Amino acid sequence: SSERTFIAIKPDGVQRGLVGEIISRFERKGFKLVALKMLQPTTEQAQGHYKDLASKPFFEGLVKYFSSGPIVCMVWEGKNVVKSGRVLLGATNPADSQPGTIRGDYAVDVGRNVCHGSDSVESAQREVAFWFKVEEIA
């Protein structure tokens, strides 16, 4: 119930006008929004977000895209919010994403995948701490 997850709507999600849509899907699940802000990520932050792929191909283009414009960062709170958050977004692979999910309804690309969610509670604590100051959290 005090569980928290980090959700980030990426620059494509913002440009396509899907910010309210994504938030609505978490509100209607019954999750509690406890932190929220918009910002344009720096290159260093984009690199941090994708640090697991630095030796991986096209890492630069991922980084460029992530910092190509403003994103919206959220912290959602609730039971199983990390795992439920993943389910709401849908499969990482649009060839497997199901309609009813955000990526299923809106995402066509696996890299520009509209939104990000924490893959574990461990990832979430780290991601929340990275993007948010303690004070910004209700």
Span interacting with a copy of itself, options 43-51, 52-60, 104-112, 117-125, rule CB under 8 A: 104-112
CA 12 – CA 67 distance, rounded (Å): 11
Q: Distance between CA atoms of 40 and 21, rounded to whole angstroms?
A: 20
Q: Does 6 bind a copy of itself (CB under 8 A)?
A: no
Q: Tell me the window of 22-30, 46-54, 57-65, 115-123 that interacts with a copy of itself (CB under 8 A).
A: 22-30
- Give the nearer residue to a copy of itself in terms of CB position, either 28 or 56: 28
CA distance 91 to 102: 9
For tokens 């640090």, name the residue: 51
Place of tokens 């932190």: 35
Residue 93 is labelled as binding a ligand = no
**Strand, helix or coil for residue 109:** coil
Residue 41 binds a copy of itself, judged by CB under 8 A: no
Which 110-129 residues touch a copy of itself, going by CB under 8 A? none
Can you say which residues are annotated as belonging to the binding site? 10, 58, 86, 92, 103, 113
